[PDB]
Amino acid sequence: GKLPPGPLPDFQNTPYCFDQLRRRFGDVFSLQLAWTPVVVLNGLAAVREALVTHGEDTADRPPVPITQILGFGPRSQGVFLARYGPAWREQRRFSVSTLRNLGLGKKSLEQWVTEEAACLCAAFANHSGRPFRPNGLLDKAVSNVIASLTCGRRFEYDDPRFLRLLDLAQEGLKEESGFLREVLNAVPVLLHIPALAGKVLRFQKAFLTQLDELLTEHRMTWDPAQPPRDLTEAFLAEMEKAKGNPESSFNDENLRIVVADLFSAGMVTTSTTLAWGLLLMILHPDVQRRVQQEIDDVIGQVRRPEMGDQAHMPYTTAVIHEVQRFGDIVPLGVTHMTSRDIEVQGFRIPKGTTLITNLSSVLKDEAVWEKPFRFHPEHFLDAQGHFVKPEAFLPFSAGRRACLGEPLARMELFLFFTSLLQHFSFSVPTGQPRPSHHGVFAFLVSPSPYELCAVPR
Ligand code: HEM
Ligand SMILES: COC(=O)C1=CO[C@@H](C)[C@H]2CN3CCc4c([nH]c5ccccc45)[C@@H]3C[C@H]12
Ligand SMILES: [Zn+2]
Ligand SMILES: [Zn+2]
């Protein structure tokens, strides 16, 4: 019956504000947000006990009433915010299998991705030696991979339509984390204001409208006499089989949501990580070199990198993992909700509690890591040079709801990162201030804006 302690009754600096209460109230503390009961879980032990040991009872999401404006319904919840049940599980399993069939785990996708990587290197080379922000090109190359798997196509980097889409996307994930958002969610009555309605999800509504245009084009070009060559076709073919089934989540309202969930995560998570990687590589030249040495030793500058190389590349694998750990791009993951009463670290957490997993607190757990607040590839290495992955490596969270795109993310990071470091040497532009290793918090945590020089080898 013991409830977790907490203060009794910020939105842009949420991560660090929680770290404050952690040292004060402990690793499992309660907190009051509007009318909504929230419990924050900190450190591996508490997150693991919640998401794994009590996995069945914490795999639900908080109701989010605003998503009604985006056409959400019982059988239309996408994957991310989908309530725990049939609509969630059908889409979740569909995405996981469909990715696999499309070539995830095969040289098929491997060779495609490493081809977009070549497009990325040519875009970089076109800056000659001049300083530039690598973010936009990172977003394009990484969007194309997920666009290809879901939408059956890539875009040219100079494509106007593609640019409006990446912008709407970026500006939309911003709206995922808002003060007003939490307001209309704990107070669902506010949606009844048609004037106030529009402005809530300005960009997300507009992103879905742009995605609709692409999906419509895609219905026209689809050859249903052929095995589906991407996720949208596979979805469309299920949608056909389900004509007459009001229970199926394969409906038109859910196609735009599912593809929005997958496209946006497949883009903003991975490229932001890579922006982190490139920033850490110019702040730590010694590390950048030691990676390039391994690349040469194992691959040379002849052929494109392959996933078969990662096995024999423990240092590069280390660095990439440490980028994720240090970069820490999703400090608070995605909220969960208890669907049942549970006990965590000795405290009672009632059914219906909003659970926040503090992934930052696990990734930078001072008890687990040698130098939690430093960029230290040896966190994933031993004295012998072998790669080790500590249990506290949870940038993808844990449980029934853990990132379904992790295998895609891992192959993208390895191939893009190695390809870039295989062909370029990155540096802070002479005469410019040393860039902050601190990050700026949107919904995600991104590096603070920086430029670099990229000179070929
Ligand atoms: C560096 C790359 C990535 C990181 C760090 C990351 C991290 C995460 C995190 C923290 C969650 C929340 C898990 C939870 O609810 O406890 C999640 C879930 C999810 N991710 Fe990822 N992710 C990455 C890449 C991707 C990719 C490439 C895709 C799509 C192909 C993707 C799609 C999803 C989806 C759909 C969910 C919701 C899972 C569910 O609700 O069952 N993510 N991810
Ligand atoms: C730019 O806007 C979007 O991508 C979206 C629009 O409407 C709904 C379907 C939004 C639902 N939202 C659910 C949560 C979430 C999303 N993308 C992520 C990417 C990483 C982490 C979390 C998320 C998606 C983004 C979706
Ligand atoms: Zn197609
Ligand atoms: Zn060893």
- DSSP H or E run through 33: strand 28-33
Indicate which atom in ligand 2 lies nearest the CA of residue 171: 1
Q: Give start and end residues of each alpha helix (H) in 178-251.
A: 179-186, 194-200, 202-221, 231-241
Structure tokens belonging to residue 349 = 């957490």
Within a 13 Å sphere around the CA of 435, how many CA atoms are in the beta-carbon half?
A: 24
Q: Which of 95, 104, 269 should be mutated for ligand 1, with most atoms under 8 A from CB?
A: 269
Rounded CA-CA distance 381/366 in Å is: 17
Does ligand 1 have an atom closer than 6 angstroms to the CB of 294? no
Residues in the chain: 457
Task: Quickly name the fold that domain 1-457 has.
Answer: Cytochrome p450 (1.10.630)
17 is known to lie in a ligand binding site: no
- 408 CA → ligand 3 middle, Å: 19
Name the residue ranges covered by the structural domains of the chain: 1-457
8 A C-beta contact, residue 241 and residue 56 = no
Atom of ligand 1 nearest to the CA of 329: 5
Does 453 appear as a known binding residue?
Answer: no
Enter the DSSP assignment of 381.
Answer: B
**From the CB of 78, is ligand 1 less than 6 Å away?**
no
The 3-state secondary structure of 109-150 reads HHHHHHHHHHHHHHHHHCCCCCCECCHHHHHHHHHHHHHHHH
Distance 450 CA to ligand 2 centre (A): 26
| Whether the Cβ atoms of residue 279 and residue 437 lie closer than 8 Å to each other | yes
Pairwise CA distance, residues 18 & 4, whole Å: 14
Query: Which DSSP symbol is given to 387?
Result: B
Integer Cα distance of 15 and 255 in angstroms: 33
Mutate to test the pocket of ligand 1, among 396, 408, 412, 413 (most ligand atoms within 8 A of CB): 396
Which residues does residue 38 pair with via DSSP β-bridges, in sequence order? Answer: 31, 354
- Report yes or no: 70 and 379 within 8 Å, Cβ to Cβ: no
Residue nearest to atom 24 of ligand 2 (CA): 261
Phi, psi angles (nearest 5°) of residue 182 = -60, -30
402 close to ligand 1 (CB < 6 Angstrom): yes
Q: Is the CB of 363 under 6 A from ligand 1?
A: no
Instruction: Give the side-chain half-sphere CA count within 13 A for 247.
Output: 4
Nearest CA to 342 out of 148, 55, 21, 45 is that of 55
Q: CB within 8 A of 395, min separation 6: which ones? A: 324, 325, 328, 329, 330, 359, 363
Q: Could you give the CA distance from residue 37 to residue 338 in angstroms, rounded to a whole number? A: 11
Rounded to an integer, what distance in angstroms lies between the CA atom of residue 372 and that of residue 434? Answer: 21
Nearest partner of 13 among 201, 187, 177, judged by Cα: 177
